[PDB]
Amino acid sequence: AFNDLLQQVGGVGRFQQIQVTLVVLPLLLMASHNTLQNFTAAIPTHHCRPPADVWLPRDRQGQPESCLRFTSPQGATEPCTDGWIYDNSTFPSTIVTEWDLVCSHRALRQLAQSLYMVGVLLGAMVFGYLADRLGRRKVLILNYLQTAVSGTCAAFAPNFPIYCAFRLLSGMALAGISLNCMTLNVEWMPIHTRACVGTLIGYVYSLGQFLLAGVAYAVPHWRHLQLLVSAPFFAFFIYSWFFIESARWHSSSGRLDLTLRALQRVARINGKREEGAKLSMEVLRASLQKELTSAMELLRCPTLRHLFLCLSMLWFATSFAYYGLVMDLQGFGVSIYLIQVIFGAVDLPAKLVGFLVINSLGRRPAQMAALLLAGICILLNGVIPQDQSIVRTSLAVLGKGCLAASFNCIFLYTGELYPTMIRQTGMGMGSTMARVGSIVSPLVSMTAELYPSMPLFIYGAVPVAASAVTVLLPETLGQPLPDTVQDLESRWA
């Protein structure tokens, strides 16, 4: 037994203590690299440049129009041609100022985010197979270097295609590093110590936002902000050479001497110089007799369809509602730094109370309550006028907290419901649908010209219909996990 071997060699000692932190360190910058678009592409106030030879319309609010200008001295008007004048009050320079991505090309700002989010999905897909074929350490270091190079070269991009391609490569590598970090940590931790690691992961991810806000305030310029955000990955790659490959993959790959050498090294670096000397080729051979010995069932057989459909719908709806909700800090009214700080601070109590609710009551009432509350909050935010921020901002924050709680709730539910044979496949498909929702969310946010309230209305309407699906999901609180598809058949009967 692998757990028996881990308990014999020393379990969680100095080796694991160093490894967990040295592996989870970059997830602090994970959130920064995920959210950096909102701060490097903030749109400032602008208006049409006066001609090179009083020249600008005004609206009911009294501000000069940003896409119109006079044609006669002080009448008819002609579209802006010469250029644009921006305001350097709060944002000295962004990509919008650099490339004049306003009016006619206002969609390129969202197109950049969409092409970046394609990268995360493609990276997950490719690098899962790459890791399964060539181990975990090599793919980790390759993704480290790719992230470093892509992030460094993205700041120096004379052309929008160059910037977009570098962003897509960065997203690919970030997906790779995240997935491989999670897999390696799970593999090296014992079986019973997995919920603790997941909590740790969640916490780190939540705590990265404060660092993002601090560094963004420190460096307002977009080029320098990008460079400073992507710089530490080089030192991270430098230290990534001192990693040890996981024993599970080595055992499953048909090679035993490497696995035994790694186990002996781990035992002798933790401190158990007596226990680490008892490992033998034949003893390990006798111990490892059970471990040594797809989508077809996930879709075709009628036993998993009625669960896969609902789980995919829930994952997609959650990601679609969350990843577009996050990137709307400018429109509330208060300073975006304070808004980011509040968004990063409110998550912890929401997840705590969500954990309490799901552990004291059934899972379906918690799921439906979270989904419906998030949808209602978003709908009310869309309906309410934007003049008052004291209530609109608070409602948006409450919706974000509810969505954050629902994410963890569904993360637990999917694994706890899927049987032992398709559990990994179901989790992978759920993550894939989540990434698809994250991809489509900016494209829905694109549809703002037809109606100002259409994006918020759609964002608040999707979870409302999504929450009504959860009723069909059977509860599993205080019940043993299903093992075969036949066992689950009796429960639904």
Name the nearest CA neighbour of 406 among 361, 364, 343: 364
The total number of residues shown for the chain amounts to 493
The reply to whether 404 and 485 lie within a common domain is yes
For residue 67, being part of any structural domain is answered with: no
Per DSSP, the three-state class of 46 is strand
Assess if residue 75 is contained within a domain. no
For residue 68, what are the CA distances in angstroms to 71, 122, 269?
10, 41, 70
CB atoms within 10 A of CB 189: 18
- Residues 272, 214: one domain? yes
Chain-centroid distance of CA 143 in Å reads: 17
Query: Does any domain span residue 52?
Result: no
> What is the C-alpha separation between 349 and 400, in angstroms, rounded?
12
In a domain, 62, yes or no: no
> Given 240, 262, 293, which residue is the final one in a domain?
293
Q: How far is the C-alpha of 101 from the C-alpha of 167, rounded, in Å? A: 17
85: enclosing H helix or E strand:
strand 84-86
- Of all helices (H) and strands (E), which one includes residue 9? helix 2-9
Structure tokens at 266: 């781990």
C-alpha to C-alpha distance for 304 and 419, rounded to whole angstroms:
10
| Number of structural domains the chain divides into | 2
Distance CA 14, CA 16 (A): 6
The strand pairing partners of 64, in sequence order, are 58
**Is there a contact between 472 and 307 (Cβ–Cβ < 8 Å)?**
no
Q: How far is CA 42 from CA 93, 168, 237, 449, in A?
A: 9, 20, 31, 19
Bridge partners (DSSP) listed for residue 58: 64
Using a 10 angstrom Cβ sphere, with 0-12 exposed, 13-18 middle and 19 or more buried, the burial of residue 117 is: buried
Q: Using an 8 Å Cβ cutoff, are 173 and 147 in contact?
A: yes
Beta-carbon contacts of residue 329 (< 8 Å; ≥ 6 apart): 38, 336, 339, 340, 343
- Regarding whether 218 and 194 lie in a shared domain, the answer is yes
CATH number at residue 404: 1.20.1250.20
- Please list, in sequence order, all residues whose beta carbon lies within 8 angstroms of the beta carbon of residue 296, skipping any fewer than 6 positions away: none
The parent domain of residue 176 ranges over 1-44+87-293
Task: Enumerate residues 6+ apart whose C-beta is below 8 A from 355.
Answer: 408
Give alpha helix (H) positions in 135-218.
137-154, 160-188, 195-218
312 and 177 inside one domain: no
Same domain, 265 and 351: no
User: Does residue 412 share a domain with residue 393?
Assistant: yes
User: What is the rounded CA–CA span in Å between residue 464 and residue 288?
Assistant: 50
Domain for residue 434, yes or no?
Answer: yes
| Torsion angles phi and psi, residue 279, rounded to 5 | -70, 140
Task: Tell me: do 303 and 286 sit in the same domain.
Answer: no
Separation between Cα atoms, residue 397 and residue 340, nearest integer Å:
10
Structure-token pair, residue 448: 């703002």
What are 475's two structure tokens? 């509860």
The reply to whether 184 falls in a domain is yes
Question: Is 277 in the same domain as 366?
Answer: no
Question: Same domain for 174 and 315?
Answer: no
Give 111's contacts (C-beta < 8 A, 6+ positions apart).
Answer: 164
Residue the block writes with tokens 């969500």: 354
Q: 342 and 405 in one domain?
A: yes
What is the spatial distance between Cα 379 and Cα 458, in angstroms, rounded to a whole number? Answer: 9
Q: How far is CA 242 from the centre of its chain?
A: 27
Structure tokens at 377: 């909050």
Residue 185 DSSP SS3? helix
Method of determination used here: cryo-EM
Phi then psi for 85, rounded to 5 degrees?
A: -110, 125
Q: In this structure, are 153 and 104 located in the same domain?
A: yes
For CA atoms 150, 153, 159, 160, the dihedral sign is positive
Q: Which residues pair with 85 in a beta bridge?
A: 47
Q: Half-sphere exposure of 9 toward its Cβ, with a 13 Å CA cutoff? A: 29
Q: Are residues 179 and 230 in the same domain?
A: yes
